[PDB]
Design a protein that fits this description.
Keywords: pentameric ligand-gated ion channels, cis-loop, cryo-EM, nanodisc, membrane protein
Assembly: pentameric
Entry title: Cryo-EM structure of nanodisc (PE:PS:PC) reconstituted GLIC at pH 4 in iiioo conformation
Number of helices of chain A: 4
Shape of chain A: rod-shaped
Order of helices and strands of chain A: EEEEEEEEEEEEHHHH
Bound molecules: 1,2-dioleoyl-sn-glycero-3-phosphoethanolamine, chloride ion
Chains A, B, C, D, E: Proton-gated ion channel
Oligomer: homopentamer
Structural class of chain A: alpha+beta
CATH architecture of the largest domain in chain A: Distorted Sandwich
Distance between the termini of chain A: 58 Å
Largest interface: A-B, 58 and 50 residues
Number of strands of chain A: 12
PDB class: membrane protein
C-alpha cells in the first residue's frame, strides 16, 4: 500500500519507544554487545478509516501486510536487525499500536579507565526514511519507553533508560536530520573484585616484605625472587578475566608500581648484604630498620596519590 | 484457509504441549542453551469439518497449507524458531493433532552460588495472538508434555518437566493476554569435582603445614613459598572450568581463606625465627607446638561456618 | 501429487541407502559432528509407467514437483539438511530411482571413560511420514550403502559403516513411525599419546623418587616440591586437549594417585628428618631403606589394579 | 535493464564515493579488519531522461527495483557485502543518483618491522566489468569521500582517507575492467606498551645483574635461574599477541639479546665459582669487578645499534 | 531447459578453469583453508545458434533459467559454494561462455612429518554427473588457469597452481562421473621458528649442563630441576599449535630426547653425590670428568642421526 496523503499540512509524527528486555554478550575486545528488546511505535493515521463505528467498537487486528509500516534503520549495527512482529492493533478510529521483538549487535564506545569502579553508557541511534507523502519527523513518548524491571544483565545494574531528539550530522541531504539517541546507564558491581584480585596481591606483597626482619641472605633472596615469580603467575591469572585494552588503566598502574616496589626491595637486600660483608653492621642495621617503616608508608602515599589522580 | 469461525461465542482452548528431543550446549557465560524439541496443539474445528463420513473413517493427513496453524511465539528466544513440521493428521471427529520440530536458543537466568552443588530451573514462555473474531485461550495438555528419556545434557541429570498457566503481567497489556511457563529442574553431578579439585588443594595445604615440625628457617621458607606458588598454579589450572561469575561463590571464598592461611603461616614462621635469633627458644618452642594443633582446628571451624552460611 | 493407489494391499517399501563423502569437525564438548553424503531412494509406483512404444530409451526423467516423493526426516540433527536433488529416473515397469546430496550436523553421545584407548559409535536415525492411503515401511539396500576412501577424521580411523535392517517401531502422539540406524565405528589413534604424555610423567616421578638416597633435608625438600610444581605444570599441558568430562576417567584416576604419592613422599621425608634430629638415626635409615623398595612396588600394583578395574 | 547505446563509441562513467562510519576488529594475526559505510553512485542514461516542461513538475523518483543499478564489487573481501538501499533519484537530464549502506570484512597485508612504533596503510579496491555493448569506467567525486567524526579504532590514530583518481585498467578474462583504490592510513598508539612490557623486563634483567656483588654460589644460582624463569613466563605472555613473520622484527631481536645476556651471565657465575674453588680468588675478584661495568655498557651499545638499524 | 542434442559423435565436453583471487585462513588443526576465485565454463549447444544477418551481429546474451547449465560441484567442501553469475555469452557457431565468482572452504589432509621444514599440496576436486540423453566429461582450458599477484598466505609462499589434464572417469551409483584435480603447492616460511624456539632451548640445555663443573649438591639440584621446569613451558608453547598425529614427527622426537637427557643428568648428579658422601671422591671426580665430555658429543651424534633419518 501507500502512506496516507497529507491532511492539513501537519507532519506525520512517529511516537517511537524501545522496551528493553535483554542485554548480554558484552564483547569488549571488539566493543560489541547484543541486545534483545522490543520496539513500540505509534503514528496517528486519521482520515484512513479502519472500521470506525460504534456497533463495531471492537479492537481490530492487522497483519504486517495490511497497513503502511514506517521504515526505521539503526545506524550503528553490524547488520540489519532480525525483527519479527509480535502484534499490530489499530483502534476503530485513532492511532495504531505496534510491537515487535528484534536482536542486533550494537557498536558503542566502552571506556575502561577506572575499570573496577566505572559507569558506562550505551547508545542506539535511530533514523527514519522519508517517503512520497508529507515529511516524517521523530518524537519520543515517555509512556512506552522503559524496561520490564527484570533485565537479565549480570554484573551491572541499570540506573536509567531515556531518550532525546538530536540532529543528524553525516552526509547531510537537506533531510534525515531528526535522529534519535537512547542512553542506557549501567554501573558495575565491584564487591567480588576485592577478594578476587586486590587482597591476594597485597598478601603476596606483604609476604615479600618480611625479609626486613631477617639477616640470612639466602633466605631473603629466596623470599623476594620467588614472591616475584608468584606475582607474575598471579598477573597471568588476572589477565584472562579482562579485555585487551591498548591504553592506560588504574589496574595497570597498580601492577607497574608493584613491579617497581619489588625492584627497590631487591636493591635494598643487596645493599644490606654488601655492607654486612664489608663490615658495617651498624649501617646495615640502620638501613633495615629504616626500611621496615619506610616501605608501607610510601606504598600507602603512592596509592592515595594515584587514586586522587584517577578518580578526580 | 482461515481460523475457524465462532459458533456460540465460546472461546477456543488450544491444548499446547512440548515434547523434548534434544537439549545441548548449556553455555553459561552467554547464559543461554539450545533446545531441540517437538510442539503439539489440540485445537478443534466445528463449522469447518474435515471429511466426517463414516465410510471414509481413514485418518486424514494434511499438508501445512490445508488448515489454519496457530502462531505461537517464544518470548525469551534470540531468533524466531525454525518450524520444521513433522506430521499433521486430522481425524474426522473434529479435533486436530499437530507435530513439528524446532531448534531455538533460549535465554534464561542462571545462579552459580554453591557452584559445585547447584540446581537450576530453566524457563520457556509462550504467547498467542488474539484474532478479531474471538479470544484464544491457552491451556496445558498433561499427556503431551514430557521427554523421551534420552535427552543428554553433559554434567547434569534431568528431574522434571512441568507446565503451568500464569498471567502475562507485562507492562504492555495490549489485550490482557495470557502466558505459559515450562520449567526444567536440573542438578549437577558433583562427585568428580571432589578428586579433581578439592583433595589436591588439601594435600598441598598439608604439605605447607608440615613446616611446624622443623627448625631450619631456609627449609621452612622454601616449603611455604613454593607451596604458595603451587597453589597459584593450581588456581590457574582450575579457573578454566568455572564460569566467569561477577559475584561471590563458595569456591572463591574457600580460595580466599586458603590465601589468608598461607599469609598467617608465613607470619608464624617469621615470628619463630625472630624469637630464636633473639634467644628465646622456650617461647619459640611453645608457639611452634601450639600452631600444630591451632591451624587444623581453625581451618575446620572456618569450613563449617562457611558451609553453614552458604547452605543455610 | 496424490500418493500411489492403495490397491496393492502390501505395504509400500522404500529402499534406503546413504553413501558417505566426507566427515569433519567431530566435537567433544557438544558431542556433535558434521557429515556430507548422498541419499538414495527407490520404490515401485504402478500409477505411472513407461512403454517401449513411446521411445526405446527405456528411461524417463521427471521433476520433483510432478511426482509423489516420500518425505524422509532425520531425527538427531540440529537443523534441516540442505537437500540438492540430482536426478530422477523411472523404470518402464514403474520403479523409481531417487537421489540427493545433503549436509548436516548430527548429535550423538560420547563416552570418554577410557580416553586414551576408547572407541566410539556414531548414530544416524531416519524416519518416514505415514500417509492416509497406503502403508510405508523402510528397508536397507546394502549395495547403496558405503563410504569414500577419502573420508577422514583427525585423530581417528574408521572401522566400518553399516545399517541395522531392523526398524524399532513405536507409536508417538497416536501415530506409528519407523526408524533406521546407521552405525559408524571409530577408534582413537593413541600411539602419539605415549611419548608425549606418559613417559615424561614417569621420568618426573622417578626424578622425585631420588630423594630416598640422600640425607640432606633442604635438597630433599627442593626436589620434592619442585617436582610437584612440575607435575602441576604438566597437568595444564595434559588438560589443554582432554575433553571436560564430568565423570570418572582413567587419566583422572592416574593423576589423583600421582598427587597422593607426592603427599606420601613429603610425609616420609618429614618423618625421616624428625627422627634424625632426635638422635635416632637407625630408625630413619631403616625407614628410608624400606621406602626405597616400597614405593615402586606399590605404584606398580596400584597401576595394575586400576587397569584391571577400568578395562575389565 | 539494458546497456545504454553510445553516441558513436563513447564509454560510460560512474562517479563513486565512500563515507566511513566506524572501523573495528582489526586483527593482527588474521590481517583483516571490518568496516561499514555509505556507498554513493551516479551515472548518466539519456534513454530515461525526464521532461519537466510538460509531463509533471517534480523529477523522477524510483524504488530499488524497476531501475538498473550497475554491478559494483569489492576485490579483497572474504564474502560479498551485505547492503541495503536507502535512496534512489533521477535528474531531468538523465543522470541518476544512488545510495546504500554496507558492511564487509577486508583482507590486507600488514608490516611489523617496527611493531611497537609502526604505521600501516589499508586498501579497498572497487571494480566493474565492461558489458559487451558499452564499456564502463569509474571516477571519484570528492564531495562524497570522507569519514564520520565518530570513526574510531581501538588503539589506532586515523590520519587520512583518500582515493587514487587514476584507475588501473587491464584486460582480464577476455574483458576490459577498471579499478579504483581507496587508502586508509593509521598509526599505532605506542604509549601503553612501555609500562606494560618494556620496563618490567628491564627490572628483571637488573635483578639478574645484581648477582655480581655477591660471592655465595647458591644465592647467585637462585637469582639468575629464577630471573630466567620469570623472563620465560613474561616472554610467553608477550608472544601470545604478536604473530610470526618471515622477517625479523624489533621485539624479537630484543628478546633474543636478553636470552644471550642471561646465558653469558650464567657462564660468568660458573667461571667465578670454579676459579674460587681452585684457590685463585684474585682472578675471580678481577673478573667480577670487570663484569660489573662490562654488562650495562654492552647492553646500552647493542640497544643503540638496534635502534639505529631498525629506525634509520 | 534441455540437454544439447547428441548429433555430434563425441559426448558433451565442458572446458573448465579456475583463477584464484586470494587464499586465506589455512587452519592447521582442522586441515582446512578458504579460497576466493573465478570459474569459467564452455560447451557446445547445436541449438541457440544464429546468423549474423537480421541484427545477428549482436552476440546473444541470455540469463539463467533460459539455457541448460551443467551442474558442477566441488567434492571436498564443507558447504555448497556461494556463487553469483557474472555474464553468459553465446557465439554464432554455438559455443557458450560462462563466468562465476565463488567462495568456499576446502578440506584437505596435511603431512607434518617434517613440521618446521615441510611442504604441502592442496587439492580441489570438480565433479559432474551424467544425463539420460548424452554423456558429460570435463576438460582443462590452459589459458584460464592462474592466480593474482596479490595472492598471499600468512606463513607460506605459493609455488605453483596447475591442473591434471586427465580426468578420472568411474561409475558411482549406476552413473558415470568425471573428476578433475587442481593442485596448489606451498612451502613453509621457517625463519621465524629458529630464533623463537630452537636457540633458547639450546641455551637452556647448555645452562643446565653447567652442573658438571660444580661439587655442591644443592646448587646442582636447583639448576637441573629449574631448567626442567623451564623446558616444560616451552614444550607447552610448541605443542599448542601442532596437532596430534598417528606417526612420529621431528620436533616430538627432539623433545623426547631432551627429556631423556634431563633424566640422565639427574641420575648422574645423584650418583656423584652418593659416591662423594661414601668417602670415594676419586671415582666421583672421574665420573664427572667423563660426563663433561660425554654429554655434548652424544647429543650432537643423536641430532645428526635423527636429521639423517627424517630428511634422508
Ligand atoms: C586480612 C583481612 C581479612 C578480612 C577481610 C574480609 C573481607 C570480605 C571477604 O573477603 O569475604 C570473603 C569471604 C566470605 O564472603 P561473604 O561476606 O560470606 O560473601 C557473601 C556475601 N557477599 O570471607 C571469608 O570466607 C572469610 C574467611 C575467614
Ligand atoms: C604490613 C607489613 C607487614 C610485614 C610483615 C610483618 C612481620 C611481623 C614480624 C614481627 C616479629 O617478628 O616480631 C617478633 C616479636 C618479638 O617479641 P618482643 O615484643 O620482642 O618480645 O613478637 C611479636 O611481635 C609477636 C607477633 C605479633 C604479631 C605480628 C604480626 C602482626 C601484624 C600482621 C600484619 C597485619 C596486616
Ligand atoms: C595406593 C592406593 C591408591 C588408590 C587410588 C584410587 C583411585 O584412583 O580412585 C579414584 C576415585 C574415582 O576415580 P576417578 O576416575 O579419579 O573419579 C574422579 C574423576 N577423576 O576417587 C576417589 O577415590 C575419591 C576420593 C575418596 C578416597 C580418598 C582417599 C584418601 C586417602 C588418604 C591417604 C593418606 C595417607 C596418610 C599416610 C600416613
Ligand atoms: C593433617 C595435617 C598433616 C600435617 C603433617 C603431619 C605429619 C608430620 C610429621 C610427624 C612426625 O615427624 O612425627 C614423627 C614421629 C616421632 O615419634 P616419637 O614420639 O619421636 O617416637 O613419628 C610419627 O609420628 C610416625 C609417623 C606418622 C606420620 C603420619 C601421620 C598422618 C599424617 C596425615 C594424616 C592424614 C591427612
Ligand atoms: C628505557 C626508557 C623508556 C623507553 C623509551 C621510550 C620510547 C618513546 C620514544 C618515542 C618513540 C616514538 C617517536 O616519536 O620516535 C620516533 C620513532 C618512530 O617514528 P618513525 O621513524 O616514523 O616510526 O621512534 C623511535 O625511533 C624509537 C625507537 C627507539 C626508542 C624506543 C626503545 C624502547 C625499548 C628499547 C630499550 C629497552 C629494551 C627493552
Ligand atoms: C641500571 C643498573 C643495572 C645494575 C643494577 C645492579 C644493582 C645496583 C647495585 C646494588 C649494590 C650496590 C652496593 O653494594 O653498593 C653499596 C655501597 C657501599 O658504600 P661504600 O662505602 O662505597 O662501600 O654503596 C652504597 O651503599 C650506595 C647505595 C647503593 C644503591 C644506590 C644505587 C641504585 C642503582 C639503581 C639502578
Ligand atoms: C656448549 C657445550 C656445553 C657448555 C657448558 C657450559 C660451559 C661452562 C664452562 C665453564 C669453564 C670453567 O668452569 O672453567 C674455567 C677455566 C678456568 O680454569 P683455569 O685455572 O684458567 O684453567 C683450568 C685449569 N685450572 O677456564 C676458563 O676460564 C675458560 C673460559 C670458559 C669459556 C667457556 C665458553 C663456553 C661457550 C659455549 C658456547
Ligand atoms: C623402574 C622404577 C624406577 C624407580 C626410580 C629410580 C630412582 C633412581 C635410581 C637410583 C639412583 C641412585 C643410585 C645410586 O646412588 O647408586 C649408588 C651406587 C654405588 O654402588 P656401591 O658403592 O657398590 O653400592 O652406584 C652405582 O654404581 C649404581 C648405578 C646407578 C646408575 C644406573 C641407574 C639406573 C636407573 C634406572 C631407572 C629405571 C629406568
Ligand atoms: C656440541 C653440542 C651440540 C650443539 C649442536 C646441536 C645441533 C646439531 C645439529 C646438526 C644438524 O642438524 O645436522 C643435520 C645435517 C643434515 O643432514 P642430512 O639429512 O644429510 O641433510 C639433509 C639433506 N640430505 O647434517 C649435516 O650437515 C652434518 C655435517 C656435519 C655437522 C657438524 C659436525 C661437526
Ligand atoms: Cl536495521
Ligand atoms: Cl519464535
Ligand atoms: Cl531434515
Ligand atoms: Cl561485493
Ligand atoms: Cl559446490
Amino acid at each position: 500500500v501507500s502512506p496516507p496523503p497529507p491532511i492539513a499540512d501537519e507532519p506525520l509524527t512517529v511516537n517511537t519507544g524501545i522496551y528493553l528486555i535483554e542485554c548480554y554478550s558484552l564483547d569488549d575486545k571488539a566493543e560489541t554487545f547484543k541486545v534483545n528488546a522490543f520496539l513500540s511505535l505509534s503514528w496517528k493515521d486519521r482520515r484512513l478509516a479502519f472500521d470506525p463505528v460504534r456497533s463495531g467498537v471492537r479492537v481490530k487486528t492487522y497483519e504486517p501486510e495490511a497497513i503502511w509500516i514506517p521504515e526505521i534503520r539503526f545506524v550503528n549495527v553490524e547488520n540489519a536487525r532480525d525483527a519479527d512482529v509480535v502484534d499490530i492493533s489499530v483502534s476503530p478510529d485513532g492511532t495504531v499500536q505496534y510491537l515487535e521483538r528484534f536482536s542486533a549487535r550494537v557498536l558503542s564506545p566502552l571506556d575502561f579507565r577506572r575499570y573496577p569502579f566505572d559507569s558506562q553508557t550505551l547508545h542506539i541511534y535511530l533514523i527514519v526514511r522519508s517517503v512520497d507523502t508529507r515529511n516524517i519527523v521523530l518524537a519520543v513518548d515517555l509512556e512506552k519507553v522503559g524496561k520490564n524491571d527484570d533485565v537479565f544483565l549480570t554484573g551491572w545494574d541499570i540506573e536509567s533508560f531515556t531518550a532525546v531528539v538530536k540532529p543528524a550530522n553525516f552526509a547531510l541531504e537537506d533531510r534525515l536530520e531528526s535522529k534519535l539517541d537512547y542512553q542506557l546507564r549501567i554501573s558495575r558491581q565491584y564487591f567480588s573484585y576485592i577478594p578476587n584480585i586486590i587482597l591476594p596481591m597485597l598478601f603476596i606483597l606483604f609476604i615479600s616484605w618480611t625479609a626486613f626482619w631477617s639477616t640470612s641472605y639466602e633466605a631473603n633472596v629466596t623470599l623476594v625472587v620467588s614472591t616475584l615469580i608468584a606475582h607474575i603467575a598471579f598477573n597471568i591469572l588476572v589477565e584472562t578475566n579482562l579485555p585487551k585494552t591498548p591504553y592506560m588503566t588504574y589496574t595497570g598502574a597498580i601492577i607497574f608500581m608493584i613491579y617497581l616496589f619489588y625492584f627497590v626491595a631487591v636493591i635494598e637486600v643487596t645493599v644490606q648484604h654488601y655492607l654486612k660483608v664489608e663490615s658495617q653492621p651498624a649501617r646495615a642495621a640502620s638501613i633495615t630498620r629504616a626500611s621496615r617503616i619506610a616501605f608501607p608508608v610510601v606504598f600507602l602515599l603512592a596509592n592515595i596519590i594515584l587514586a586522587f589522580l584517577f578518580f578526580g
